[PDB]
Design a binder for this molecule. Structure first.
Ligand SMILES: Cc1cnc(CNS(=O)(=O)C[C@@H](C)c2ccccc2)o1
Ligand SMILES: [Zn+2]
Length: 139
């Protein structure tokens, strides 16, 4: 589990969105596994605006933050999970690291701010849904 709290927005994995998220929806995209809802309180996270390929992510199944190198956001075939059939996921970045289903929502960050959230896992890989192109999160 986990979210990004920037401005009056809450960014979560679409597959983990709650009824309150869907009842206060700003934007959602199944192909990216992302959903954004509105919040009453202002958040403290800041979004990175860059093309970094190194950063640090939080892994809840290890209670640890790991430094990783990751690929640029791309269209990748992701195997079936409990939440999606095997399909192409867009704006996804991969790194070598540990990721179990419940690790979704952990933040990946670089020197400029939050880069994305954990979205995929298995086989010693971790995949992150990028948010750096969503410029509207800043206003
Ligand atoms: C990059 C890639 C291709 N095929 C896959 C694996 N697909 S999945 O990540 O949707 C599987 C899911 C159960 C999960 C496991 C662990 C963590 C977060 C989700 O990943
Ligand atoms: Zn950066």
């Amino acid at each position: 589990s986990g979210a990004i709290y920037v401005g009056n927005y809450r960014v979560v994995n679409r597959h983990l969105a709650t009824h309150n998220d869907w009842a206060n929806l700003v934007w959602e995209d199944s192909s990216r596994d992302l959903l954004v809802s509105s919040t009453t309180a202002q958040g403290c996270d800041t979004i990175a605006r860059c093309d970094c390929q190194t950063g640090v992510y939080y892994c809840s199944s290890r209670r640890k933050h790991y430094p990783v190198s990751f690929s640029k956001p791309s269209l990748i075939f992701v195997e079936a999970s409990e939440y999606y059939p095997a399909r192409y996921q867009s704006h996804l970045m991969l790194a070598v690291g540990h990721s179990e289903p419940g690790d979704c929502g952990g933040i990946l960050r670089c020197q400029h701010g939050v880069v994305g959230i954990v979205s995929t896992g298995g086989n010693g890989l971790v995949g992150f849904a990028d948010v750096r192109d969503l410029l509207w999160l800043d206003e």
